[PDB]
Design a protein around this ligand. Structure first.
Ligand SMILES: CC(=O)N[C@@H]1[C@@H](O)[C@H](O[C@@H]2O[C@H](CO)[C@H](O)[C@H](O[C@]3(C(=O)O)C[C@H](O)[C@@H](NC(C)=O)[C@H]([C@H](O)[C@H](O)CO)O3)[C@H]2O)[C@@H](CO)O[C@H]1O
Ligand SMILES: CC(=O)N[C@@H]1[C@@H](O)[C@H](O[C@@H]2O[C@H](CO)[C@H](O)[C@H](O[C@]3(C(=O)O)C[C@H](O)[C@@H](NC(C)=O)[C@H]([C@H](O)[C@H](O)CO)O3)[C@H]2O)[C@@H](CO)O[C@H]1O
Ligand SMILES: CC(=O)N[C@@H]1[C@@H](O)[C@H](O[C@@H]2O[C@H](CO)[C@H](O)[C@H](O[C@]3(C(=O)O)C[C@H](O)[C@@H](NC(C)=O)[C@H]([C@H](O)[C@H](O)CO)O3)[C@H]2O)[C@@H](CO)O[C@H]1O
Ligand SMILES: CC(=O)N[C@@H]1[C@@H](O)[C@H](O[C@@H]2O[C@H](CO)[C@H](O)[C@H](O[C@]3(C(=O)O)C[C@H](O)[C@@H](NC(C)=O)[C@H]([C@H](O)[C@H](O)CO)O3)[C@H]2O)[C@@H](CO)O[C@H]1O
Ligand SMILES: CC(=O)N[C@@H]1[C@@H](O)[C@H](O[C@@H]2O[C@H](CO)[C@H](O)[C@H](O[C@]3(C(=O)O)C[C@H](O)[C@@H](NC(C)=O)[C@H]([C@H](O)[C@H](O)CO)O3)[C@H]2O)[C@@H](CO)O[C@H]1O
Ligand SMILES: CC(=O)N[C@@H]1[C@@H](O)[C@H](O[C@@H]2O[C@H](CO)[C@H](O)[C@H](O[C@]3(C(=O)O)C[C@H](O)[C@@H](NC(C)=O)[C@H]([C@H](O)[C@H](O)CO)O3)[C@H]2O)[C@@H](CO)O[C@H]1O
Lengths: 115, 114, 114, 114, 114
């Protein structure tokens, strides 16, 4: 598996606009909400859950990176794998998207996998 | 168990106004006090205890998040579970609320269970 | 044991004015000096020593919190247990006080055990 | 092995312009892009993969330092080992360079091996 | 062993002006350069190596503290043990000094052994 796998999904020029920390089924988790820098579209929501899913090893790394990018409000590319979380109230509040990577962006290029 | 469970309680549009760190019964713990951003209402106090309660796994993440929101003074939704802590002097100093979640807010809308 | 035990000692309305990090007897440690925010009185000195004393579990949490309160210069209540460190040269340089808690203080109160 | 081994490659007077965090084959990884502070030349790209290669022990140290230098935009020397990473799409997206060191460069010569 | 042992050396009224991170012989390490705040004297260089020397246990604490004092520019007392590191190209790039302590300095005092 890789953040950049073609079967994952990514969204460019997003601003991390909200951040939530909680616990579910023995695991600390966090979720982020992102919106397009230009105000268009619908928000993207993605979560990472400690010790759950194949992405568990990167939980702390992604939490720390999401915190930083949230604090600056810079435009980023968010990478997700869809349809990972299944707890239904959790998905309804947040989403089933697993956060799998974050990339900084210049105005012309995001520094991370694409296509 | 989940932060968003109906059996928990939450308070929106709150600012973390005080922070305390200590140890009890070999466990580090911290407590926060929050107040409504507009100054109305009654303070909310909640604590997390590293080795105690079902919420023990989230101690470090909530400590780090509480510290961040404390440092910025931004408006948050604080999620607690009532009647968790039982040592009377501790409860009387702070409260029996376990801290179970923290959500950011933009204006009057917060990003978290409700 | 608890930060708030009556057999501990605390000092309110203090500012963390100095910070030292070192190692002793295989243990990283840190010490802080605090002084009254209003300039009166004599300093308080306390140390936390990584794998030493009953307070060892909270070493990292207290170091992180001391660094934060040091960086802001805000008024705090420092909680100590007296007569813990026994190495006389270490005590004479710093003190025998173990650091056991830190509480933010407003103009009117401190958020922690009294 | 050593960051400073002459078989490695380094670039002085750079700034960290981009940062990426992800996971591959159960390992956290990060990559950085650097460019000459003065705008000349071409970018340098390097990655660290937490579970992989002799450099694995320094993953967190390098990630933390990369984040700090990225946050400030200060001049740095970046040290890499060429021709390490193998997965073709990963290499094409980023590079085959392993990040093996970072040096501040706030004076005449960067503070690192040359 | 103790930071304050007379067999160590220290330098007051210094400011951390450079920081480097790397790895050698599977061990993460960092080095700092300090200069006198008033511009006099000769720079002090010291390194910590994560699993080498009797000072190995304090590696992370001193890296974190070095980073803190580097970022604030404040005047410090740096404590070293001389003649510890031995790899010649490393020693000639940096120095043989092990970093063993960091103490904040006001303007007439430093808070640490002397
Ligand atoms: C670039 C182009 O074809 N037309 C431009 C452009 O402004 C715009 O298209 C969108 O603009 C940028 C350019 O990359 C976006 O990056 C969109 O590409 C991606 C993305 O990286 O964000 C690709 C990605 O694979 C897509 N993810 C998924 C799951 O499908 C996303 C996603 O569709 C969008 O981010 C959702 O908003 O887009 C690119 O589509 C168009 C229309 O605005 O008009 C021209 O100006
Ligand atoms: C000061 C007071 O008593 N107010 C309530 C009144 O606000 C309440 O309905 C309110 O409806 C709005 C709709 O925008 C919000 O949903 C308020 O939500 C919460 C909150 O998010 O803060 C919900 C939460 O469940 C409540 N927490 C608990 C433990 O009950 C809090 C909480 O009451 C306040 O935060 C305390 O200051 O409010 C919601 O308050 C109606 C309900 O009868 O009338 C008043 O009682
Ligand atoms: C009085 C009663 O009815 N108790 C029952 C009993 O089944 C059980 O009591 C709790 O569970 C064990 C003992 O079985 C603990 O001794 C609880 O006491 C402490 C603890 O030792 O951990 C005291 C401690 O000071 C508290 N920590 C604080 C205040 O910071 C904790 C803390 O409140 C809890 O750990 C939170 O989960 O408890 C004792 O109260 C409980 C099982 O939950 O159920 C009662 O019906
Ligand atoms: C006009 C004026 O400033 N008068 C001060 C007077 O306020 C001050 O009294 C102190 O007021 C603070 C208020 O936060 C506390 O109530 C002090 O009580 C404690 C403390 O909390 O710090 C209680 C504590 O148990 C004591 N600790 C020990 C080991 O005994 C400490 C300790 O004695 C003092 O902190 C040392 O100064 O005090 C209360 O003393 C007094 C004393 O600072 O000085 C007037 O000028
Ligand atoms: C050399 C000098 O005193 N003054 C300028 C100078 O602007 C520039 O030369 C560069 O000067 C820097 C600052 O010390 C370095 O010395 C450059 O040498 C290195 C480097 O440290 O960056 C050595 C290194 O071994 C090289 N790495 C590899 C893999 O070969 C790099 C690399 O070639 C460059 O960084 C790529 O741009 O260079 C030194 O090049 C030149 C600019 O033309 O002009 C002098 O007058
Ligand atoms: C500091 C400078 O550049 N010039 C001198 C100054 O040396 C001299 O007195 C100095 O005053 C400072 C005040 O903090 C210290 O007391 C200096 O003592 C020490 C130190 O703590 O830095 C003692 C220490 O044991 C010495 N370390 C070693 C390995 O010998 C260091 C060391 O010699 C110096 O730091 C290196 O610069 O000095 C003390 O020397 C005053 C006269 O009082 O005049 C200045 O110009």
């Amino acid at each position: 598996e890789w953040t950049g796998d073609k079967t994952n999904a990514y969204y460019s020029d997003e601003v991390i606009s909200e951040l939530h920390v909680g616990q579910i089924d023995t695991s600390p988790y966090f979720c982020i909400k992102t919106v397009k820098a230009n105000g268009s579209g619908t928000p993207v929501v993605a979560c990472a859950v400690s010790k759950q899913s194949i992405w568990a090893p990167s939980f702390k790394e992604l939490l720390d990176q999401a915190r930083y990018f949230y604090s600056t409000g810079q435009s980023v590319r968010i990478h997700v794998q869809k349809n990972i979380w299944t707890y239904p109230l959790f998905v309804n509040t947040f989403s089933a998207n697993a956060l799998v990577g974050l990339s900084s962006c210049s105005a012309t290029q995001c520094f991370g996998p694409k296509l």
